[PDB]
Write an enzyme that holds these catalytic residues in place. Structure first.
Site, mmCIF file in Angstrom:
data_model
loop_
_atom_site.group_PDB
_atom_site.id
_atom_site.type_symbol
_atom_site.label_atom_id
_atom_site.label_comp_id
_atom_site.label_asym_id
_atom_site.label_seq_id
_atom_site.Cartn_x
_atom_site.Cartn_y
_atom_site.Cartn_z
ATOM 1 N N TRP A 1 0.822 -1.173 0.000
ATOM 2 C CA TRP A 1 0.000 0.000 0.000
ATOM 3 C C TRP A 1 0.875 1.249 0.000
ATOM 4 C CZ3 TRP A 1 0.296 -3.461 3.833
ATOM 5 C CH2 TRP A 1 0.288 -3.059 5.174
ATOM 6 N N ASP A 2 0.977 1.946 1.118
ATOM 7 C CA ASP A 2 1.745 3.192 1.219
ATOM 8 C C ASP A 2 3.114 2.973 0.607
ATOM 9 O OD1 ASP A 2 -0.444 3.835 2.876
ATOM 10 O OD2 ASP A 2 0.813 4.367 4.530
ATOM 11 N N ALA B 1 4.330 3.880 8.192
ATOM 12 C CA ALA B 1 5.011 4.603 7.135
ATOM 13 C C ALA B 1 5.927 5.712 7.594
ATOM 14 C CB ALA B 1 4.026 5.142 6.124
ATOM 15 N N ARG C 1 1.977 9.666 13.292
ATOM 16 C CA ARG C 1 2.613 8.806 12.301
ATOM 17 C C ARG C 1 3.060 9.592 11.067
ATOM 18 N NH1 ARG C 1 -2.727 6.848 12.688
ATOM 19 N NH2 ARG C 1 -4.103 7.561 10.999
ATOM 20 N N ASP C 2 3.711 8.902 10.134
ATOM 21 C CA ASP C 2 4.019 9.411 8.801
ATOM 22 C C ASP C 2 5.074 10.517 8.798
ATOM 23 O OD1 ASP C 2 2.050 7.585 7.916
ATOM 24 O OD2 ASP C 2 0.563 9.153 7.473
ATOM 25 N N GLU D 1 -3.474 12.860 6.982
ATOM 26 C CA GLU D 1 -2.423 11.861 6.903
ATOM 27 C C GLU D 1 -1.306 12.271 5.965
ATOM 28 O OE1 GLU D 1 -3.815 7.792 6.313
ATOM 29 O OE2 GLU D 1 -5.871 8.423 6.510
#
Length: 417
Positions: A46-47, A133, A203-204, A288
């Site tokens: 995915w990501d 991620a 996150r991220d 996100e």
């Protein structure tokens, strides 16, 4: 003294969100075909996180393009995934990806038709089995990479791990990613914690060197600090809504923000949390994968969000949203008036996700769910067609569709070790 306006979060308001148009051909992703190819018969991806330098340039190494992916095993023989007729149900396996996510890498000399490389870190290196991620930063001509990622459960911590890319004329390996270092987690005064909200986001990580100051900073997704349910949608969060649109409902439960941290050194070792750049209280719970494109002396700040996570009484598509400022610390204004940059078409509202706008204008995303009939659909877990956008002042425009997973390099780096 030259007084400067103080830095303040930019608010993405309910009034801004009321401008979101899901039917604008200039801000709609092209339709994904139901016959899309699938990159692996063993894993879902995915990501997708292209290898890049600290300045944002997408990089190949000795001619090899490299991408990192969140990855999960396919489990076609698991009893848990057999339906009443004894047939495998891919949707259940796909939905369970997040809880078993790990980082893989892939490589190609064409920027497409990716060859799988496997795990970046050996099983057990990560302090958490879940590897969420971030960003792989190519550091130097020895091929050293700092992988910034999110170590998830317990908690959610921005971490990094050093290793090296090694190439031959046949392919690429990732070696020596052995020692994960904790950088920061939510603090509870600026960014919301798990204590305050069991559904909190943190996150991220997206580290970058600011083109103006040369200082290192890093974006990440968070939520505005405070106990879940305690936030207030006040005049500034509501914004300049039209008559009849004054009710905020229970939108105080939606509290997404784009956070930023600053580094005390050039090596990305020791970081300090700063207050948020963009807040979306009453508007969206999930801002996100925040990331920058620097263009025309401006800061284009992109974030990915969902229809589902909108504030009560608002809606819009899954896809990429964004903002522009003359300055790193704002003020930002919503692109296209509403913030929407690239939404999924309403006929295929979940076709793609986790878009990444690169400095060359190309936007990569993964395929989630594509309808194939009145009732049927296919799951992706593979790369979607890349699409080119143009940034122009406070406008964006979708231009041209490219092949599945096309992620060409901006620079090539000669690596020897």
């Amino acid at each position: 003294i030259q007084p400067y306006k103080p830095t303040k979060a930019t608010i993405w308001s309910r009034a801004d969100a009321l401008k979101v148009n899901e039917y604008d051909p200039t801000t709609t992703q092209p339709l994904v075909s139901g016959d899309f190819p699938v990159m692996s018969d063993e894993v879902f991806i995915w990501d997708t996180m292209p290898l890049r330098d600290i300045d944002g340039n997408i990089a190949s190494v000795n001619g090899w393009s490299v991408i990192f992916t969140l990855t999960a095993d396919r489990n076609p023989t698991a009893p848990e995934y057999q339906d009443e007729q004894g047939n495998y149900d891919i949707t259940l396996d796909w939905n369970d990806r997040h809880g078993r996510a790990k980082m893989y890498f892939w490589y190609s000399r064409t920027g497409k038709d990716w060859i799988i490389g496997g795990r970046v870190m050996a099983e057990g290196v990560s302090p958490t089995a879940r590897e969420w991620a971030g960003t792989p930063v190519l550091l130097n001509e020895r091929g050293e990479i700092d992988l910034y990622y999110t170590a998830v459960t317990p908690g959610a911590t921005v971490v990094k791990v050093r290793g090296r890319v090694v190439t031959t004329e046949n392919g690429v390996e990732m070696v020596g990613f052995k020692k994960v270092k904790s950088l920061f987690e939510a603090d509870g005064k600026m960014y919301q914690t798990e204590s305050q909200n069991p559904y909190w986001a943190f996150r991220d990580p997206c580290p970058f060197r600011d083109p103006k100051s040369g200082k290192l900073y890093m974006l990440f997704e968070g939520n505005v600090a405070g106990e879940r349910g305690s936030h207030v949608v006040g005049p500034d969060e509501l914004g300049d809504v039209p008559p009849g649109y004054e009710d905020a409902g229970n939108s105080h439960f939606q509290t997404g923000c784009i956070g930023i941290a600053v580094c005390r050194d050039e090596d990305g070792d020791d970081w300090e949390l700063l207050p948020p750049l963009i807040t979306a209280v009453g508007v969206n719970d999930q801002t996100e994968r925040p990331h920058f494109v620097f263009q025309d002396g401006k800061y284009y700040l992109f974030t990915i969000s969902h229809k589902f996570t909108y504030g009560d009484g608002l809606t819009g598509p899954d896809g990429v949203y964004g903002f522009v400022s003359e300055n790193l610390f704002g003020p930002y204004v919503p692109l296209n008036g509403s913030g929407l940059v690239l939404g999924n078409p309403p006929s295929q509202p979940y076709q793609t996700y986790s878009h990444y706008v690169m400095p060359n204008g190309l936007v990569t995303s993964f395929i989630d769910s594509v309808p194939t009939g009145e009732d049927s659909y296919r799951i992706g877990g593979t790369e979607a067609p890349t699409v080119l956008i143009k940034l122009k002042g406070a406008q964006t425009f979708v231009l041209e569709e490219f092949d599945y997973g096309y992620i060409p390099p901006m620079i090539d780096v000669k690596v020897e070790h």
